[PDB]
């Protein structure tokens, strides 16, 4: 996260670190959404152009962490993956459209002060909250500067941008399944998501019911924190019907 700052303890209890087993390294962010379900970005698991193709067998999720490296004793929980569910319409050739995946844990994680699931939005929530200028909050252990590696979870607050501006910003083709967010070049304040931050949630707090909703997923962006450049985020609601269908079918 560029231009961020350290998370407060328990500030982002839904944050999930996606960790490959060997060589032991951080891959991506992710978010706890139930006690058995973690939501990430697809490209974290399957990006052929980078020869990236991971199996449930290959990875761990670490839940409730604050420090990037250290093993939090009596804080962090470590889950095993039972089933990756990459989106059937996920396009990795064109423009990372539908960059989303659902992971089911072998065993439910027990919630604590540090571990807690975020909410997913509905028509009303998405409708009243996804307007341009409205700010959300991006979290991760990714790169501080474009080339990073903080030793502690990072937070930045970024405003939703309107689709016209998103378009003119990149040569890459946009779909409706994406929103861009970030500061315009005259706006004096800056910040962005970066490499290592994918899968991580874009949350907003509701003024109605006082809850945190995951509206997005760090997906992509050319560079980190360039002027006139904006980070792009998977549109969590527009895929919610799939998220629900999946969980309804392979849960209960």
């Amino acid at each position: 996260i560029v231009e961020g700052s350290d998370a407060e303890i328990g500030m982002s209890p839904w944050q999930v670190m996606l960790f490959r087993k060997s060589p032991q390294e951080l891959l991506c962010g992710a978010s706890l959404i139930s006690d058995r379900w973690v939501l990430t970005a697809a490209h974290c698991l399957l990006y052929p152009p980078w020869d990236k193709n991971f199996t449930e067998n290959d990875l761990l999720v670490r839940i409730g962490k604050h420090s990037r490296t250290r093993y939090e004793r009596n804080i962090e929980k470590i889950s095993m993956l039972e089933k990756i569910y990459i989106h059937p319409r996920y396009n990795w050739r064109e423009n990372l459209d539908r960059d989303i995946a659902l992971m089911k844990l072998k065993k439910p994680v027990a919630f604590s002060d540090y571990i807690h699931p975020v909410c997913l939005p509905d028509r009303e929530t998405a409708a009243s909250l996804l307007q341009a200028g409205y700010k959300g909050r991006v979290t991760g252990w990714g790169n501080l500067k474009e080339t990073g590696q903080p030793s502690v979870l990072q937070v930045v607050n970024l405003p939703i941008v309107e689709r016209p501006v998103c378009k003119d910003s990149t040569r890459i083709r946009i779909t409706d399944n994406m929103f861009c967010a970030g500061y315009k070049p005259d706006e004096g304040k800056r910040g962005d998501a970066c490499e290592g931050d994918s899968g991580g949630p874009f949350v907003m707090k509701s003024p109605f019911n006082n809850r945190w909703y995951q509206m997005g997923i760090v997906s992509w962006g050319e560079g980190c924190d360039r002027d006139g450049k904006y980070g792009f985020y998977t549109h969590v609601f527009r895929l919610k019907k799939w998220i629900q269908k999946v969980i309804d079918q392979f849960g209960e």
Partner: peptide, 26 residues
């Protein structure tokens, strides 16, 4: 059910240092 509320913030009637900034942009 329980989702969206933090054991160390919402549930203890405390806010984080920056969440106001989010609420002010509505």
């Amino acid at each position: 059910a329980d989702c969206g509320l933090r054991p160390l913030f919402e549930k203890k009637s405390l806010e984080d240092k920056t969440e106001r900034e989010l609420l002010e942009s509505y």
